[PDB]
Amino acid sequence: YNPTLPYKRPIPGGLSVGMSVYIQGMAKENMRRFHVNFAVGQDDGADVAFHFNPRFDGWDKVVFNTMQSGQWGKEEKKKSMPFQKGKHFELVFMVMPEHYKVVVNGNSFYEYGHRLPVQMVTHLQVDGDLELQSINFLGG
Amino acid sequence: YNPTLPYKRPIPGGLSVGMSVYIQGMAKENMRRFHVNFAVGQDDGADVAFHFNPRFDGWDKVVFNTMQSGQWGKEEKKKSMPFQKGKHFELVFMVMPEHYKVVVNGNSFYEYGHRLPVQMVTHLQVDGDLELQSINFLGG
Amino acid sequence: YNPTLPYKRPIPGGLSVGMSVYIQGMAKENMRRFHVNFAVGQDDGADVAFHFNPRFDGWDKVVFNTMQSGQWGKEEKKKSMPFQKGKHFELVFMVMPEHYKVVVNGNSFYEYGHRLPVQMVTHLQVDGDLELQSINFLGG
Amino acid sequence: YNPTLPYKRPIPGGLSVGMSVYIQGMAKENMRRFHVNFAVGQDDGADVAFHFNPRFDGWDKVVFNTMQSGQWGKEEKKKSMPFQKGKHFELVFMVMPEHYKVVVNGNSFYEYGHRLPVQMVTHLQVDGDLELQSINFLGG
Ligand SMILES: OC[C@H]1O[C@@H](O[C@H]2[C@H](O)[C@@H](O)[C@@H](O)O[C@@H]2CO)[C@H](O)[C@@H](O)[C@H]1O
Ligand SMILES: OC[C@H]1O[C@@H](O[C@H]2[C@H](O)[C@@H](O)[C@@H](O)O[C@@H]2CO)[C@H](O)[C@@H](O)[C@H]1O
Ligand SMILES: OC[C@H]1O[C@@H](O[C@H]2[C@H](O)[C@@H](O)[C@@H](O)O[C@@H]2CO)[C@H](O)[C@@H](O)[C@H]1O
Numbered sequence A, B, C, D: 001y002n003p004t005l006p007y008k009r010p011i012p013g014g015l016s017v018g019m020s021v022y023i024q025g026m027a028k029e030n031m032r033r034f035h036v037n038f039a040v041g042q043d044d045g046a047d048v049a050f051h052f053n054p055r056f057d058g059w060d061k062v063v064f065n066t067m068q069s070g071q072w073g074k075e076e077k078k079k080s081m082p083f084q085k086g087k088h089f090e091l092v093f094m095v096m097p098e099h100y101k102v103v104v105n106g107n108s109f110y111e112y113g114h115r116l117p118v119q120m121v122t123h124l125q126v127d128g129d130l131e132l133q134s135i136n137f138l139g140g
């Protein structure tokens, strides 16, 4: 009865500053990558205020970006991998006035400055090499 | 049917922290400069909480300033030009507690610390060497 | 009909984050010092969340402090004097989540981190070598 | 009639950004340590968004941590002791968007970045080598 992928669901009330999203799943044993998108609308090539994108590669890293008017911006990356193949994780996004704060398994991970206004984000999209267990929205 | 210049319109409800303004237009092919003012009232020499002022010069740059009791303060500038002559742009201002954040074509550009209280800004004024397409206020 | 000194008046609704105070007066020609206190209650030795205290001395400076349970804390100071003897000034305090931001004559001056919760401040007290013209509270 | 220890009480309305907690007690003469927990629920091994934990040791210090899904995260510490054995103290926590700000006896002490969303904290727990006099919640 776990959510199938791709997961795409509205954020109840829309995204607003002060909200958090909290995200339990498992990285697949053979994971290459997955993403979570804070999306502007329901369409499938919707703009994305915040794309959070762990990648196992040469350098295991997380990539962060925004898609606006259909175009990816300047990638930010952190060359650190807080997920592990085959392991359960807890992934939390907190929406602060200046940034999304990302916390993985209780460990602060990254702060991504807003590039598109928070109150454009209406949907959460999740897909890739993971199994999704729960998604809960808080404070909205 | 595009807006004529100078454009001067009230911000619905007044400016408040958490609001954004999003601004589509085109830099003219022969642009020297333009500005967007976050203005205190409707009069034509009203104070300006935030003047955003791209200038092609020797050094292509953006100038940022505040006019208070009729006098320009200390200019801030960034010696980088995110607009291009003859090209369409997307210009976003996000009103955070400490600053206006400016994002141009999806690329974070500048943070201008507040010098006059946000809740004095009642009007948006736009003028100069641009063609204006849309202005949308969000979160207010 | 200008306000007499010491000036002590309630802040309508109490102080809250997002509020500003804006303060027109004149430094006296023979000014040594003055202060503005964000006070906890109406009594005369009330605690003070934020004491803003320009001083002409050897080093012309502004002193910033908090009085809690009747005791002054660690002074902060900036060795710069934005007022001038005999001159009119505009003094603005903006209450942000992390600090009071002080702006004098349109020029950002200082950010004083909160030491006592903002929602303890109920009164504004002003006294010293100045003539007071106007005090206006915004956003509360 | 002072509160007995361990003290565990709900935060009226739940914790929210903008709230403060203010905490008068006395360090015991023979204090080794005490803590204040911002807890997620009433159970006794509840998760803890913020554990504030002064310790007299070799190095007198304060330890700060989060317990999530039953596990302590990466300790932060400050090798400074703002309490003193046998002395009364005033301990204030201010909940800002990015961090808890800790102020002890009027002196700013530490800012602890949020690791679990504020709006998960429902209870305050206090225990250890102290005598507790008052706990007051503000702005909620
Ligand atoms: O930036 C987020 C997107 O990256 C896209 O891939 C990039 C790649 O990371 C970069 O190195 C370069 O090769 O350009 C590619 C296309 O922009 C992914 O295709 C996309 O899914 C996002 O992860
Ligand atoms: O600071 C914003 C205003 O600048 C004014 O021009 C300045 C100029 O930039 C500066 O170098 C100096 O020469 O003083 C001028 C007058 O203050 C513009 O006239 C005004 O429109 C704003 O852009
Ligand atoms: O810190 C704000 C208060 O300062 C007091 O004076 C201080 C003085 O600045 C310091 O150098 C030292 O001498 O201790 C004095 C007493 O704490 C003023 O008396 C008071 O009005 C505030 O300005």
Ligand SMILES: OC[C@H]1O[C@@H](O[C@H]2[C@H](O)[C@@H](O)[C@@H](O)O[C@@H]2CO)[C@H](O)[C@@H](O)[C@H]1O
Pocket: D051, D053, D063, D064, D065, D072, D075
């Ligand atoms: O981090 C907060 C908790 O610390 C626990 O003790 C730690 C200790 O500080 C550390 O040095 C190491 O030895 O691991 C211990 C167990 O995680 C306390 O037991 C606990 O009460 C908290 O203070």
Ligand code: NA
Pocket: A097, A098, B097, B098, C097, C098, D097, D098
């Ligand atoms: Na902030």
